[PDB]
Each structure stands twice: as C-alpha cells, then as structure tokens.
C-alpha cells in the first residue's frame, strides 16, 4: 500500500481577483413594493374579549403577499397584584400570542378550503427554526428556556428593552411591540396595559416558513379566512413567577377588553420584466397532525431539586398509531395538560428515556440518554440549549445555599423548560429499509417516553405525551384559478432508486422540497 | 386539473461523500503579508486639540492597502463631575470617533482628487452594515440603541470589558481600544483619560465596504490625504446620562490635549503567481449626497412617556429635490441639529409616518405605520432592533412604578434612539416604470415625515429632516496612472431589457456591483 | 483614458423564481442513525481519582463514528471554603476538562498506532475554531476571556444556567452537563459535587475538526485507545477568584473520588444506496508539534494596572528551530508554566511585540503593535476579542475609583486572559518565495516575544514562550485494512506552478484540504 498522488492548488485572497470589465456587471432592481399594503376588516364586529369566530372575506386580483399578518389590539387588566409592587421586568406577552390563541383556522382560496391548527403549528415551529426567521413572524418570538421566570434571571423574557441583552429576544414591554401602561395609583392592586401585536398567520397555505422571501399567491377571486378566536388571557398574558399576590388569592385574575383585529396584506400588480407567470405554481405547505396522545396523573414523592437519579421516573406509552404513509419527521413532547398557574411558562417534562416501536421492530433508542436525545433533536432543527431541553435543575448553587431554609428550597429552584424531541425515520435505523420519508407504505408506531417533572414532593399534575407528524405536503395553484393540495408520496422502490444528493444543487434556481 | 409529476432525489449526509484522490486537493497559500505596514506622519505638526487641517503626502510604489487607517492619540480632561463619583461603566467614546470628527476629506491619487464627507458617510453606514464588518472599521463600532445611557442598562455602551455582554460591542474602557485613566484624588471633580483609536478612514475611494478583503490600489506616484480635523470633545467623548454634575453646573466641560495623528498603510510588491495586473481596475466607491434638508422648533406639550397616541405629531416637509438621475437607495432621518448635552447620544426622532412624492405620483407610503417602516428599512440593511428604531418608551414599567414620583418620571424614562429609514426606488411601486435604480432620467422628489421627539412637556428643540441619496459610483484605475470616477448610468430601456438575476452568479469570480 | 462599457443585469427577489415542475424536486432521506450507540468499558478498573493509564479495546465491523466521545463521571470535594459562603455562580469546570486531563493518547487502528497529545491539541484548537463547532466537542467549550473570574462579571463562565447570558457559553452548574451538589450543613467549610462530562476525544485520527458531519472509519479489526489519564483537580475543577478561604489557608484543597470512564461510539452498517465504499478513504488529521520552548522568572517592579507604557516589558527568545519542511500555520503564546492557584484561569501574558527570524531574514513583524497582532491572529482563526487578547487592564474605572484604597487596587484589577498569535508563512512576506506552506524545504526559525504579565509589583512568576506548528497531515484508510499517515509535501516549484484558487470550487463534492 502507498498513498495516492493528490493534485495541488495555490490559494490566494479574493482581493487579487481584480474587478475589471470582464468580471463586473452593474445591477438595477425591481422588488415587491411597500406602497401596496391594505387593511382588511372582518365581516362582523369582533368580540370585545377576543372569544369567538372571526371571519375575513376579501377578493384580491393580481399578487397577494404569501405571509399575511393578523394585527390584534386590546386592553388587559391584571388583578390581585400585591400593593405597591414595582413590576419591573415582570409583565409581558407569551410567545406567539396571536397564533397560540387560534386552535383552528379555515382559509378559502377560489373554492378550495384549507383547514389547519395554528396553535399546534406554532407550538412545534417555535422550537424548530432560525430565531431571526421567527422574529419576522412575531414580535414575541422568544420561547421560554426555564419553567419559572424571575426578574433577576439573565434571559428573563419580560425584561424591558433597556434591561434585555437582546430586545428582539425579549417579550417584555418596550421591545418589539407597541404598548401603554395606564397610570398606577399608590396602593393599587391592579394594572391595565394596552397592547398591539402584528403577527404573521401560521396556517395552511401561508408561507410562514419562507418569511424571509415569501412566494405570493395570485388572482384570488374568493379569499376568506375563518378563525376560531381564542384570544383569552391564558394564551397571551405573561406574569413573572416572583410577582407577589394579594393576601388570600391563589392566582392572578385577568380580563381582555376592547379587542379589535384586522388582517394586513400586500397586494400588487406583477411586473412585466419577470415574464409570464407559469401555468402551475407550487407552494411548500407542511401538514402537521397529532398522531396520538395519552395522559396520566404524575405524583412526585421525592424532591425534583434533589438527587437527579432519585427524581420520579414517570412512564407514558401511546397506543398503536396507524399511518398509511411515512412522514418526514416526528415530534415528541410531554406537557402539562391543565396548567395550575395560567400566566406562567408551559410546563414540559424533561424526557430522560425514549423507546420506539415500528411494526415488528421494538426498543429503538432505548440505549440513548439525555445528551444523545438532545443531539438527535438538535440535528433535526431543535433551536434551544441543553439547560432548557434537559429539564434539570438550572440553579443548584442558589438552592444548595445553606442560607436558604428547607421550606424555601422549591421556591428558589428553577428547572429547564423541558424537552421536545424531533426525529426522522432515517434516525431509527430500521432493518426494514422501505420505511423512508415520503414512502407510500403503511406502518404502526408506538412511543414510550420516560420523564421527570418539576412539581414538588407530595404534589402532582396531569401530563400528556403527544406524538406529532410533520408530513411534506404541497399546494398547487393552477392558471384557471383552481387550488389543490396533496402529500408527495412515492413507492419505496422509486425513492431507493433515485439519484444521490450529498450537497446543494449547483443550479441555484432549483428547489428541493421536503425529505 | 391534476398535480404535475415531480422528480425525486435521495438526500444523504456529506460524510458519505468520501474523501478520495478523485475529489481531494492539497492547497498551498500566498497572501497579503503583515511585514508591510508603514506609519506616515503628516507634513506639519498636528494641532494639540485636534482642530484644523491635517495633510498626509507620501508617494507609494507597487500595491497599497485599500483600507488605510488613521491612528489618533490624545488626553481628554472631563470637568464638573460630582465629588467621589465612582464612574463605573459611565465613561467611553462615541461611535466611530475618528470619522465622526472629519466633516470633509480630500484624497489625491495621481492628480485625481476625491472629495467626500466622512462624518456623513459613517453616520449612514453605521446603521447599514454587518456589525462584525463594522468592528473591523472601528474599535467603537457599537451604535446607541437608546436616547439615554445609564450605568445599569444591559447594553450600556460604556460598560467596561468585564461588565459587557460582548466587549466587541461596547465603547467602554478595557474593550477594543487602549487607554489610561490618570490617578483620581479623593474629592476630585475631574478626571484625565488617555486614548488611542486605530480606525479605518471612511472616504472615497477607500474600500471601507470591503473591509474583510479589500482590493489594493497600485502605483501611487502622487498620494495625498487632506483632512478637515474636527476632533472636538463633542465628536469623541461619551459620558453616561446618570453621571452627576457639580452644584451650579449645567453640562460637563471637556478639553482635548496632546493630540497626535498618523496614517497606517500596508505597502507590498505584487506576487508573480497571480500574473499580470489588468490594464483597468475597478473599485466600488459609493457616492453619498445630502439631497435636501429642513428644520423647525419642535415643542412638546404632552409627556413623551405618556399615551403614545397623544405624543406630539411633528411634521417636516422638504422642498422639491431635483435629481438628474435615479439613485439606488435613499436614507431618511430626523435628528436634533443643535444638541443640548454635548456628550450624550445623538437624539433622533421616532418617525411614525412617511409621505413621499415623486413627480406627479403623490402620497406614497402614507398607509405605512412604524412596524412596516421598520420592516422596509430592515429589508434595505437597517441593522438595529425595533425598540431602538421606533423611538418609543423603552422602560414603561420602571416609569409607571408608583414609587417614582411625578416629578421624576422624565428622568427615569428612556426612549429608543430613533428612526433611520432606508428605501429604494423599487420600494415606491411607481406607475412610472422608468424610475429605476441607475436610470439616466430626471425626477423631482418631496419627502414628508411625521415624528415624535423625546423632550419633556413644556420643552423643545430644533430637529432637522435629512434626505440622503446613496448612488452607485465606480472609480477606475488605469495602467498609465490615471484615476477617474463616474456614476453607472444607463437608459430605462437598457435596464428593462437586461437579463434577470433571481440568484447569485454560479461563476464565483463574477462581481455584481450596485443596484 | 475612458471608462470601459459594463454590462447590465436586472435583479429581482427570489420569490419571483416561481416553484414549478421544472425547478422543484421532492427529497427522501437516508442518514446516520441514532439506534447505533455502544458503550465501551475499559479493559481494567479505572483509577478512583482519575490518575493512571486507561485502555479501551474493542473490534468493530462496518462503520464507526469518526468523532468518538469519552464520558467521565466523578465526585469532587472542595475544602477550605469560608463558612456559609453562598457560592452563587462561583463553581464549575475548566474548559474542555476531559482533553485537558490527557497529556498523551495512543489510538491503534488495524495495527497502525497514532500518538498525539490531546491537552496540547485542545489548548490551541479552543482558540482557533467556530464556537458552535466547539460546543459540539465539549459541554465546557467556553474559554476564559479574563485572568480573574468574579461572580458579578457579565460573562463569568461559572454563572448558573438562569444567570448566564448564554448557557451554552457557560461552564457553570445547570448548563450543558449533569451534576449534583451534596447537601451543605450550616457552618460547613467544604462541598461535594458530582459531575458527568460527555466530551469528544481530540486525538489523531479523530474527526474533531469536522464535528458537524464527521466521516466515519470502517472495518476496525483492531481498535484500541490508550490514555494517559491525568484527571486531577487542576485540569478539571474551576473556582472563582472571589471565593473566600478559611483563615490560615493559601489555596483550596480538592480531590477526585468515584472516578469512572467509558467510551461512546456509533457503529452501523453502510447503506447500499451510497454504493460501494471507495478503495482508499482520506481523513484530515492535523499534526500539532511543539517546535520550541524557553522560560524565565518574570519580575514586575511596577503595577500592571498602572501606566500601560510603564508595565515591565519582558523578553523571551527561542533557540533556533530546525524544521525539514514548512508548516501551514504557527501558534505563539506565553503562559505561566507553574500556576500559583490551581483552580483559576490559565495565566497568559499580553504579547505587545513579536520579532521573527527565518533563515537569513531577520526582524519580521518588528513594526507591528498589539492591534495588528490581534488582526493577524484573527485573520488566521483566533476566535476571541481584543479585550481578552491584549492582556490589558479590563476594568480601569473600577480600579481608579478613589473609594478603592491603594492596598486593594490589585485585588479589584482584572486583565484580559492574554495573547495567542496564529500566523502563516505567507504572512511573513519573505524574500525567499520558496518558503511556502507544505513546501519540502528545510528552514531555521527564531521567535522573540515582548510581553507584559498580570502579577503585582514586587512579585513574579515563571513564564514559558511556546511556539507550535500546525502541519497538514492526512490519514489514509486502505480497503485491505491498512492505515497510514503522512505529511502532504511538495517541491516549491510544484506549488508555485499550481493553478490559482481565488474562490471555493463550483463542484461542491470537491474538498480542498490544508494550506
């Protein structure tokens, strides 16, 4: 054996590639103009507390912006605050408050209805995208890293603009959204705050994924958007966990008043320079479905801030989930189904173990510990840090401090927000090689998750294991006005025989959707 | 209608692209050496307080570095500080203090003079570039996010190295620049600080835009740089707004002494491996011009920290701006023309509305509110967050706190620094399709800006609306020694008929300048 | 002279590149599965304090993950802590604690032994890579910015998860690694903390550089890993400099107990879709060598927090370093050879000057001041800020505060961690153009470094100037099982005549190694 001959190259700086008449060109520009925005009012008066069906109906010729936005404005009254609380860096909005407040939405484009679930869509998408991309969707794009929020915490998401490390990554007042706090009298136990939130609608077939440069829709003879409006305090208002309550009150009481809503769209004539618009335009419109869920009361007997190994290992196992084709990705999370406190972070469990069954293949990922489950999820787009994901004790030295008495340990204890595990069928390493993304092949799946919860010793709460699927799904816009959508399914043999793609395509006009 | 047939591909990791003799090559390197730096002294002794004309004159054969740097050193005495003030995280330099201190500069290259205005150039460029790119221009590249700077504020730009979230993005002591504080006696009301600032000169035709990998200049038989030196305390020294004054003093008094200045260049022989240097070398050298300005006294009757809707809507409208060709970009800002406090941030207004007239087309962008104006500016390179841009109350909870009395509300209130709106002619969405970037066509423009200011109720100040143009302008270096510069102008018909560019060029050597 | 004609293009958004059947394709996927992890125990019981030889021996067929990980777990008892110290944000691990604890490692692949020095490798690599890449190697990837760590410091690397600006970039508890603090009784002067660290092995031929997507090894009939285990407290445990000691104690006393260690690998069967594995696979496996070192006692007579110009200019000059070929990069650092405090940061000097001799060419880089040395090092991958690199006083206002008495100046004074200067032979700008990266040409090098140290006046310590080389070195895996490694050397004339590469290759499957 001998090493093979390797050819040589002489690297030199790009500065020596001299700009000349042979390699320089002057650009002019056309673009999507900003003189083209219009405000669409709903067909009837929106409910003053934001609870009820809301409908928009507006035909639009030519091009319509692919990421239309909903603009809500309202007053929130927060009661049962201890008298003369400063509330510095302690009040704000929850993450993606518009889409979190819409359990279901129906969009009609030229007689074709699209039914989707924005609250579910954004619940997954918020953990699975570039933060700067998410900041263009919502002014409240930052997601909670920890299960309790306190004023001093460094990345406290209710920090004001001047008190935040990055005001873009805060949901506090004086950050990305307009607000006004009503005057607070001395001795007052309540506060009124006006809000305005301009957020992109996360619902099929909108282009929330391509919010950087969204492909517009064309020639909408019929265009309706029907929302299940659930803009209730629990889906919007956030209060830090160290805000003190009035004596004899368990939780804060919040009321939404003066609720208004409009849809903001861009509408413009296509320029002649780009040429004739093609007969059939394709749009990436992912189908998210809850494949299975199951819950149980989880009772902690031992301290969650104590020895990590002695934390109560709660187990939930789904029923068999029948699927007629293979999704491109799955998402697993264990969350508190009925929250105790309405305005605190979403209580997710720290998943410490995961075993998966697919048809006859059993015990997949059984060997994996938290670090590898984090690595797995991160490799499929999970956008947060291990301190959050793990659900482990985040401030052990603060709690272990002997100055903190035994009765106040739990109060001081702050945990990571919890786990969301994204996995693809290729990660499973199935000996059945026909089980591949977008394969037209039926399968049965069962998911068991072992997890730890942040509740104190002698207390408990209900937790639900959820398994979602993210299927590749396209929407087709035909020249005659018709809209259709379908899954992109092929036989195992087609996909196995297809050409390899180890890199991006050299032709930059090409797009490779799904997988 | 039926969905079209789509071809399939099988994606696999880059790890499976095995390195072999067929796809591996070994590199060696040549580069711009670091043994090549020269210090050029000015022709005469520089003024000890940094006020006056400063001239460099140095012929240089072969290749000269495209981004030459000015290195200033001086002592600053700050007086009227309250006795025994700690000054922790409260003293530093303003952003780009070298270029901010040069209102005009003349560079001569082989008989061709280039006249530019560095203070204007950098005032725009600081808001319109990648932060890491800007950190290579100046050690004081961080721009103010808020109109008042206080010691506690999280991104306080006078935070010391150990107290900063990112010492690169601070302008404090113990960050990117050398300094020395003279010993402070107990009871002293003044402090002396030595500074040294090594900053790239932002003046045509220097390659401040391509600071990463600048294209060098060749064979400078004549090379002169003539600066209007205005290195005043007001253009350099920063003092936090919560530093307390001596009794009976309105503002701090600052004196510059021991001012020295040199120019740092790289000069080297071109390597033979890159081949013959081409006959004509092209350089990107943007032309920034103040197209129009107008000002007025703006009196606030209502509190700026009060109801945002009731903040005084000040209006300024430019005269008709005649232009013989169409610039690629415009910039609009409303700024305080005579500052009250000399060492505080530049007070910009929060622009809440913008009406633009171009020829017979009137009322463009009238529908746009702050979020969309921010989106517009950000899409054309604006590099700061909404909390800053908006000019809105940044710390509402701190101010609304009942512990803060009515007389101290204003003192506690901190606002966003204010708006800078970048827009292209394509953003306007004009009926007249001949109005395109780099079109050789005459136009008349008028700009009206509606804005709010940060001054208290019963006070006011003078604010000037400025409308800048950023024209595409190239500098040509001919083999015989001649330098020329010209705008890159073409007929509307030429530009309309040109080939479309939806993506970057596949050939990596190709540059596409302007647009 | 006249400007040349330049061709025009019309730029337009990527949204107008409509997705159609002509430019869209649907992907399916294969990937490196997560069902494939194995835990390998060592051949004998690991030493309970982590001191001794540790050997792994495990044959592995098919594909083995190119970046195998070592997982250490242990208990650390820290004694001599002042009674009832809170220890908030004051205890954690040093950077890369696994690899720092291994002075030498031998890896056997099918009879071919690779001897490397992980502690040296990571000492350089931690300063010379993308932080997000480094975070995948170790949970303690953040490197010290300053020579002293205090609790209040903004980027204090022992900040807990909830107290960190970025928990990924902290080495504190409740961040990237599992831990447990044993209960602390009132009046206790010691604390016991369990740790678990899962860290990639940095040793030839592992793919620690390509940690994102590592190329796996194949068909290991013999696979042994022999470690010089030096998992001692000084290489792992970190204690903040403002933690107070028990009366009559000079330093903290720490000992390791319950030490265990395993190796985590991925092992899987290559999928048939990628085709036949090529005969010879190439791996990038850089060779780092200590070319020369020299030391001396460095006594500071004047205050390091005083006038920067009056700080003692210590000089160290290496002996002549004979090398038979030209390395692609060099690294220079001046470090404290025997630390005074065992659990504080590594004390590096601030290098203010650097003279280099190569053969008959003397005084290279003699003109360069600290800003240019920082620029030089950063252009070759140095990943930290000037505040750190310079070694200058980081908190001058804090120290110059008259409230701080003359005797407490040094205690308050915090300095940048110090300099690491990376330079290539092309940076030197030698007359002798045959001295190029990977040239098979012998040379003699001498390096002189002028530097300042952070020790107080009337004290001193031993500092060693180290000069490392980073040679391009490839490992070849032959189909018959054989492994070889060699430097990639060519004649000067071969490299000079090779084709120019001003940009990346258009073919994305091509790799260009070294240079």
Whether C84 and C107 have beta carbons less than 8 Å apart is answered as: no
Q: What is the DSSP letter of C361?
A: E
Distances (CA, A) of C220 to A136, A402, C40, C482: 49, 52, 14, 10
**Cα–Cα distance, B503 to A507 (Å, whole number):** 10
What's the distance, CA B370 to chain centroid? 22
Stated as kind and residue range, the H or E segment containing B293 is strand B287-300
Question: What span, in angstroms and rounded, lies between the C-alpha atoms of B57 and B263?
Answer: 10
CB A511 within 8 A of CB C24: yes
CA dist list (Å): B241 to B174, B251, B414, C252 = 20, 11, 10, 43
* Alpha-carbon gap: A140 to the closest alpha carbon of chain B (Å): 12
- Residues A452 and A309: their CA atoms lie apart, in Å, by 10
Among C393, C433, C504, beta carbon nearest to B508 = C504
Rounded Cα distance between C343 and C93, Å, is: 9
**Closest CB from B3, B283, B426 relative to A476:** B3
Structure tokens at C53: 């030889």
Q: Using alpha carbons only, how large is chain C's radius of gyration in Å?
A: 26
DSSP one-letter string for A106-156: EEEETTEEEEE-HHHHHHHHTTSS-HHHHHHH-TT----SBSS--SS-TT-
C-alpha to C-alpha distance for A85 and A38, rounded to whole angstroms: 42
- Which chains have 3+ CB pairs within 8 A of B? A, C
Give the span between the Cα atoms of C288 and C334, in whole angstroms. Answer: 17
DSSP string, C152-195: T-TT-TT--GGG-S-GGG--BTTSSSEEEEPP--TT---EEEEE
Q: Are the C-beta atoms of residues A143 and A115 closer than 8 Å to each other?
A: no
For A425, the enclosing helix (H) or strand (E) is none
> Regarding beta strands B280-284 and B237-239, do their DSSP bridges make them parallel or antiparallel, or are they unpaired?
unpaired
Q: How many helices (H) and strands (E) does chain C have?
A: 8, 29
For A289, residues 6+ apart whose C-beta sits below 8 A from its C-beta are A468, A469, A471
CB of A447 closer than 8 Å to CB of A290: no
Paired tokens of A319: 């029923």
Tokens linked to C497:
């005549």
Q: Residue A141 to residues A126, A167, A417, B392: CA-CA distances in angstroms?
A: 7, 11, 16, 20
Give chain B positions within 8 Å (CB) of A28.
436-439, 490, 495, 498, 515
Per-window interface: A 375-434 vs C, CB < 8 A: 375-376, 385-388, 390, 392-398, 400-403, 414, 416, 423-429, 433
Q: How many Å apart are CA C235 and CA B10, to the nearest integer?
A: 46
Question: Any residues with CB less than 8 A from the CB of C437 and at least 6 apart, and which?
Answer: B27, B28, B29, C326, C327, C328, C329, C424, C425, C426, C472, C514, C515
Whether cis (ω within 30° of 0) applies to the bond prior to A205 is yes
Test A509 with B488 for CB contact under 8 angstroms.
Answer: no
What tokens appear for C107 in the block?
């890896």
Distance from CA of B319 to the nearest CA of C (A): 31
| Range 441-480 of A in CB contact (< 8 A) with C | 472
Residue B64: closest CA among B240, B229, B277: B277
H/E element, C296: strand C287-300
Elucidation method? X-ray
With a CB cutoff of 8 Å and minimum separation 6, the contacts of C451 are C313, C314, C315, C316, C334, C349, C350, C351, C352, C353, C391, C419, C463
**Residue C238: alpha-carbon gap to chain centroid:** 17
The answer to whether B148 and B70 are in contact (CB under 8 A) is: no
**Closest Cα partner for B452 from B348, B296, B345?**
B348
Please give the resolution of this entry in Å, rounded to 1 decimal.
2.4
Residues across chain C: 515
Looking at the complex, report in whole angstroms how far the Cα of residue B440 sits from the nearest Cα belonging to chain C: 14
Contacts of C27 in chain A (CB under 8 A): 437-438, 501, 512-515
Closest-CA residue in chain A for B33? A13
A2–chain B Cβ distance below 8 A for any pair: no
- Dihedral sign of CA atoms A143, A148, A149, A154 in order: negative
Q: Which helix (H) or strand (E) holds B77?
A: strand B69-79
**Cβ atoms within 10 Å, residue B7:** 10
Chains that touch C (3 or more CB pairs under 8 A): A, B
* Rounded Cα–Cα distance for residues B305 and B454 (Å): 8
DSSP characters over B422-481: EE-GGGG--S-TT--TTB---EEEEEEEEEE--PPTTEEEEEEEEEEEEE-EEEEEETTS
CA distances from B314 to B207, B353, B354, B369, C315 (A): 39, 10, 12, 15, 64
Pick from B280, B302, B397 the residue to mutate for testing the A interface (most A CBs within 10 Å). B397
Distance of alpha carbon A347 from alpha carbon B269, whole angstroms: 65
- Answer whether B165's CB lies under 8 Å from A165's CB: yes
Q: Going by C-beta distance under 8 Å and a sequence separation of 6 or more, which residues neighbour residue B51?
A: B229, B230, B231, B232
- Report chain C's terminal Cα–Cα distance, integer Å: 40
Enter the DSSP assignment of A288.
Answer: E
Using left for φ > 0, alpha for ψ between -120 and 50, and beta otherwise, residue A414 falls in: beta
Q: How far is CA A269 from CA A502, B163, B495, C251, in A?
A: 39, 52, 20, 75
B124 Ramachandran zone, left/alpha/beta (phi>0; psi -120 to 50): alpha
Beginning with the edge strand found earlier in the chain, give each strand of the sheet holding B329-336 in spatial order.
B287-300, B459-471, B329-336, B421-423
Residues of C in contact with A504 (CB under 8 A): 508
Does C395 contact B161 at a Cβ distance shorter than 8 Å?
Answer: yes
Residues ending a continuous segment of chain C before a break (C–N > 2.5 Å)? none
Largest CA distance in chain B: 87
What is the distance between the alpha carbons of residues C384 and A188, in angstroms, rounded to a whole number? 50
DSSP category for residue C503: S
Cα separations in angstroms, A308 against A304, A352, A400, B358, C74: 7, 11, 14, 68, 15
Q: Are strands B329-336 and B500-501 parallel, antiparallel or unpaired?
A: unpaired
CA distance A92 to chain C (A): 19
The label of the residue with tokens 């690397």 reads C157
Tell me which residue has tokens 């109060």: A411
Burial of residue A505 (CB within 10 Å: 0-12, 13-18, 19+) is middle
Rg (CA), chain B: 26
Strand ranges for C349-455 from DSSP E? 350-358, 361-364, 420-423, 443-452
Query: Mind giving me the DSSP string for B205-258?
Result: T--STT-SSPPPEEEESSEEEEEEEE--GGGTEEE-TTPPBPTT-SS-EEEEEE
Q: Is the peptide bond before C205 cis (omega within 30 degrees of 0)?
A: yes
Strand pairing report for B253-268 and B69-79: antiparallel
Phi/psi at A48 (5° precision):
-65, -20
**Is there a contact between C288 and C124 (Cβ–Cβ < 8 Å)?**
yes
Helix (H, G, I), strand (E, B) or coil at C270: coil
**Cα-based angle C371, C372, C377 (whole degrees, multiple of 5):** 100
Q: Tell me how far apart the alpha carbons of residues A474 and A465 are, in angstroms, rounded to a whole number.
A: 29
| ∠ Cα B395 B397 B401 (to 5°) | 125
Secondary structure letter of residue B308 according to DSSP: G
**What is the β-pairing status of strands A459-471 and A483-487?**
unpaired
Of all residues in chain B, the one with the smallest CA distance to C394 is B174
Separation of alpha carbons C363 and B113, rounded Å: 37
Nearest to B394 by CA among C18, A178, A131: A178
- Are C465 and C295 within 8 A, CB to CB? yes
CB contact B303 to C (< 8 Å): no
Residues A59 and A250 sit within 8 Å (Cβ to Cβ): no
Tokens of B182: 């003279």
CA dihedral for C40, C45, C48, C50, sign (positive or negative)? negative
C304 vs C307: CA distance, rounded Å: 8
3-state secondary structure of B170: coil
The SS3 of residue B383 is coil
What tokens does B430 get? 């004009």
User: Which residue matches tokens 């701190």?
Assistant: B398
Is B20 near chain C, with CB under 8 Å?
yes
Tell me which H or E stretch contains C37: strand C37-40
The closest CB to that of C376, out of B14, B34, B184, belongs to B34
User: Do the beta carbons of residue A359 and residue A432 sit within 8 Å?
Assistant: yes
Listed as own residue / partner, the contacts of C272-275 with beta carbons closer than 8 Å and 24 or more positions apart are: C273/A496, C273/A500, C273/B10, C273/B12, C273/C30, C274/A500, C274/B12, C274/B16, C274/C30
Distances (CA, A) of B167 to A484, B173, B346, B385: 53, 10, 22, 19
B277 → closest Cβ in A15, A18, A476: A18
Q: What does DSSP say about strands B443-452 and B314-317: parallel, antiparallel, or unpaired?
A: antiparallel
Phi and psi at residue A131, to the nearest 5°: -55, -40
Beta-carbon count within 10 A of A434 CB? 14
Q: Which residue has the tokens 């819409």?
A: A102
CA dist B178 to A399, B133, B233, C277, C352, Å?
41, 20, 18, 56, 12
Torsion, Cα C63 C68 C73 C77, to 10 degrees, reads: 170
CA atoms of C28 and B335, how far apart (whole Å): 55
* Cα B239 from Cα B228, distance rounded (Å): 25
Q: How do beta strands B329-336 and B421-423 pair?
A: antiparallel
Q: Which residue has the tokens 């669409």?
A: A40
Cα A105 to Cα A205: distance, rounded to the nearest angstrom:
11
Q: Do A508 and B506 touch (CB under 8 A)?
A: yes
Put simply, the chain A residues between 93 and 132 with a CB less than 8 A from any chain C CB are none
Nearest to A15 among B153, B215, B397 (CB): B215
Helical segments of A33-130, H only: 97-100, 118-125
CB atoms closer than 10 angstroms to residue C476 = 23
Question: Is cis: bond before C403, omega within 30 of 0?
Answer: no
Determine contact: A512 vs chain C, CB below 8 A: yes
Q: Tell me the backbone φ, ψ of residue C483, rounded to 5 degrees.
A: -115, 135
Based on DSSP, count helices (H) and strands (E) in chain A, helices before strands.
8, 29
Chain centre distance of CA A422: 13
Separation CA A307–CA A320 (nearest Å): 34
Q: How far is CA B83 from CA B80, B183, B321, C394, in A?
A: 9, 14, 52, 24
Of C360, C323, C330, C283, nearest to C440 (Cα)? C323
Residue where the block lists tokens 């005579």 = B338
Q: What residues of A are in contact with residue B345 (Cβ under 8 Å)?
A: none
Chain length of chain B: 515
Task: Tally DSSP H helices, then E strands, for chain B.
Answer: 8, 29
Token pair recorded at residue C448: 């002189």
Residues shown for chain A: 515
* Residues facing C29 on adjacent strands: B11
């Amino acid at each position: 054996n001998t090493p093979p001959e390797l050819d040589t190259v002489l690297q030199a700086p790009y500065a020596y590639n001299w700009p000349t008449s042979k390699n320089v060109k002057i650009a002019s520009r056309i673009g999507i103009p900003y003189s083209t925005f219009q405000t669409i009012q709903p067909v009837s008066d929106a409910p003053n507390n934001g609870i009820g069906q809301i409908t928009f109906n507006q035909p639009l010729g030519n091009l319509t912006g692919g990421a239309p936005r909903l603009r809500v404005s309202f007053t929130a009254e927060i009661k049962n605050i201890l008298a003369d609380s400063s509330l510095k860096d302690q009040i704000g909005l929850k993450s993606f408050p518009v889409n979190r407040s819409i359990p279901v939405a129906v969009i009609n484009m030229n007689g074709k209805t699209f039914t989707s679930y924005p609250a579910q869509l954004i619940k997954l998408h918020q953990y699975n995208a570039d933060p700067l991309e998410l900041a263009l969707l919502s002014p409240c794009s930052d997601v909670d890293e920890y299960n309790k929020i306190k004023a001093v915490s460094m990345n406290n998401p209710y920090r004001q603009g001047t008190e935040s490390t990055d005001s873009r990554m805060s949901r506090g007042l004086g950050c990305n959204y307009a607000y006004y706090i009503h005057p607070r009298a001395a001795g007052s136990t309540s506060v009124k705050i006006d809000f305005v939130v301009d957020e992109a609608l996360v619902a099929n077939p909108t282009q929330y994924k391509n919010i950087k440069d969204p492909v517009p829709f064309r020639n909408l003879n019929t265009f309706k958007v029907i929302l299940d409006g659930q803009f209730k305090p629990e889906n919007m208002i956030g209060i830090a966990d160290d805000v003190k309550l009035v004596a004899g009150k368990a939780d804060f009481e919040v009321d939404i008043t003066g609720f208004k809503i409009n849809m903001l769209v861009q509408n413009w004539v296509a320029p002649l320079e780009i040429g004739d618009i093609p007969k059939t335009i394709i749009y990436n419109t992912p189908l998210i479905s809850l494949e299975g869920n199951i819950s149980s009361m989880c009772l902690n007997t031992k301290d969650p801030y104590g020895i990590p190994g002695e934390r109560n290992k709660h187990i939930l196992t789904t029923h068999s989930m029948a699927m007629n084709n293979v999704p491109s990705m799955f998402a697993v999370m264990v969350s508190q189904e009925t929250p105790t406190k309405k305005f605190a972070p979403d209580q997710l469990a720290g998943i410490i173990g995961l075993e998966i069954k697919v048809d006859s293949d059993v015990g997949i990922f059984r060997e994996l510990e938290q670090q590898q489950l984090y690595e797995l999820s991160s490799s499929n787009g999970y956008n947060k840090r291990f301190s959050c994901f793990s659900g482990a004790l985040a401030n052990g030295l603060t709690v272990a401090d002997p100055a903190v008495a035994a009765g106040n340990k739990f109060k001081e204890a702050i945990f990571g927000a919890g786990s969301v595990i994204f996995f693809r069928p290729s990660d499973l390493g199935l000996k059945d090689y026909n089980v591949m993304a977008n394969a037209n092949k039926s399968i049965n799946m069962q998911v068991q998750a072992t997890f730890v919860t942040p509740e104190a010793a002698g207390t408990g709460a209900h937790y639900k294991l959820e398994v979602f699927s993210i299927r590749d799904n396209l929407t087709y816009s035909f020249e005659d006005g018709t809209f259709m959508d379908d899954l992109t399914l092929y036989t195992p043999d087609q996909l196995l025989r297809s050409p390899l793609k180890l890199t991006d395509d050299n032709n930059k006009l090409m797009r490779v959707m799904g997988g």
